[PDB]
Design a protein around this nucleic acid. Sequence first.
RNA 1: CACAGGUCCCAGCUAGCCCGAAAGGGUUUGUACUGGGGCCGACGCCUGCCCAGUGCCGGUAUGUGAAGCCCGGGUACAACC
RNA 2: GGGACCGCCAGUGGCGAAGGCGCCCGGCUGGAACGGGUCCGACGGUGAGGGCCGAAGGCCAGGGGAGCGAACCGGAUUAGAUACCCGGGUAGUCCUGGCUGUAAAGGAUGCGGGCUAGGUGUCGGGCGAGCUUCGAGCUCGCCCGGUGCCGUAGGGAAGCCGUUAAGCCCGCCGCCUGGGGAGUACGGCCGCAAGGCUGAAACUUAAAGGAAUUGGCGGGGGAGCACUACAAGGGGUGGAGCGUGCGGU
Lengths: 128, 185, 64, 60
Amino acid sequence: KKEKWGIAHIYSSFNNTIIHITDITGAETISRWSGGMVVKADRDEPSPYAAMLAARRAAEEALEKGIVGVHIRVRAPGGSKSKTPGPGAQAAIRALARAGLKIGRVEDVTPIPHDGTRPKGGRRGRRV
Amino acid sequence: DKWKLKQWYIIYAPDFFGGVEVGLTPADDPEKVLNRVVEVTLKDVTGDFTKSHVKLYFQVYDVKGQNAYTKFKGMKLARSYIRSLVRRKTTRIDGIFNITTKDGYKLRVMAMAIAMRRIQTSQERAIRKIMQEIIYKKAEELNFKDFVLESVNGKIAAEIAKEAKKIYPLRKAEIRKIKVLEEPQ
Amino acid sequence: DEGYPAEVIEIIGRTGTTGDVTQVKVRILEGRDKGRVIRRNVRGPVRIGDILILRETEREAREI
Amino acid sequence: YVRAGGTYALVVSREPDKVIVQLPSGELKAFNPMCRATIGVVAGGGRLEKPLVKAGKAYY
RNA sequence: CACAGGUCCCAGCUAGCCCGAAAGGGUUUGUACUGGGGCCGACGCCUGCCCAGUGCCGGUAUGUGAAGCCCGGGUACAACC
RNA sequence: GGGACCGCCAGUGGCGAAGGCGCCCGGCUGGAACGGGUCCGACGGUGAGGGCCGAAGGCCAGGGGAGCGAACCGGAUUAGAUACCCGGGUAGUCCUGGCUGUAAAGGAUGCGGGCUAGGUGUCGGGCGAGCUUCGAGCUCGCCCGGUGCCGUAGGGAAGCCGUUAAGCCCGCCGCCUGGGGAGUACGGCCGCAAGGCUGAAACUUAAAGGAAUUGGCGGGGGAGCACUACAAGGGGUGGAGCGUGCGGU
């Protein structure tokens, strides 16, 4: 068939967003970009704007490297942490769409525990 | 710049799955692509749109000059599909089974049954025993490749539903997961 | 890219800390996404049929 | 190595070039694969549970 | 003074510590529940703050830092700079 | 490679005297409901003393220690922060054998028996009827036993309870006699310790305490309104001399 398809792993949280493009197997990295080096203040890294910028940069790198199609994999921290993706997940996906990348299957691979470890914060939780 | 040093290899699916190309992988040496795992769907492997929720894992085992052939490793149903299948006011029966195929493959099979309404623990136990019996009989009757094909196809689940209708009607029956533990020797 | 014109075709309501921003729905008049209907925020007095020059047509405003 | 009463070592990994073993002190040491060892634990463990009590006991 | 008990430090073996000029040797027919080195000193309740000073340990980018080596001068060769 | 925990299904759901008890098969074992023209024949209820179990935490000894995290150490906020927030972290949380016997261990309601309108969900069993893909399947009604809600007579200060009584009766034990002092002092018993059980006086006080009503508040919620509120704007005051009115001398 001769089409180079990859996988875009999106790590979305309430503090930062990471976009990482890799080959079909996932063992070879193509482009890794996040909001930390795109924005300046720590409060704007998880912003959808920073998500769009980082996803766009990763898309340009992948296109120059010779990637046309990609399968999305959204991921929240999961485990004992939050189970909900951050604001910069759909923004990153649509930025990848805008940059000129074909999008195949879209899935959430957040690690869900089957009554695993104890979450942080104590029994009373955070009281701010 | 290290990227130019990389050259692409073509992934080939297992022969019993049609042996069709599934993707391209970049690597420097043929050794670095020996045990790479690629996740595909039965829809892409064969063509049927219905089985879009079934996922197959193919693991490389040999390289023949830009042609990396793979072998079956496991199968898992989609998380969204499982979530849709499971619902409140219904009973979910799960069966974990370690089985040996006729040829000698060691497999772990994870089967699921969804009932129309809440049922008693005794009924769930009876359904679990029925699933165990059918799975064991199929394991001792079939070989590895045809057993895996049967599991991916909705035939073993069909037999599970047909036999478990005696205890209680079933909303659905599935072989939700399969893992290849040890290869035969 | 010198902006893109979009025509206001429906008003949702007011919004903001002091109720200054009006949410509206706009159809893109020219560009790569010509004719697409999006929801965008607007500052100032706005009617139906007004033409707004949007720098980009990527993001969509959140619902009320 | 590991000859005192009540001591043992844990075989962690087996490689063609070295075998890793965790010793009583908590160190992971690499041994040649052909080194000989005996399975089990050394008898006589737990001595330090009982105090000596007497200066004469210490003397002997 | 010692003592049983407490606690700290070095050491995975050709180790740690020690005698000697060397060869060789003590701990060692030993192997961390062990060998060696300090302080307090049954038992009961407890042992708070301080690493700027001295000491010990780890790093040492950077400055200094002996001989040797290299370069230029000097010596028909060296000394010497 | 390791050590905890068994996600959704999960329910006013189910089992246990209570504390408590959720992955899956096999073995052992306790109790209860239902259906019995079955067996004994008052063998029953409650129980001062006494015995057994008993969350978390803590202790003794031996193991383990993944994640959390008292003490502690650092970073922040603050006038201060020995805290709330953030980064690490020992005991502990876990297993084996024992001690401790303490909880808002609360249905804040002790246990057995008889009686006093109904209605409506759900769990187990039994009976009858209708469907059924004949399923240990589905639907309806009735009896018994659990588990919720509304509710009539009646009860209560009221909140509310009302056949699961907090209603009228027949029994037994335990506990209370204004708020503090005070679960303190002394004495005794138990426990390795921490602690547990038992438990007063002098003196002081007019109230403490419960239910409910109206209002006033909340850095509670929801509707509204205001250029002596804001949002968008015009002009200013606050800085200088002076007019005038205050405070002070």
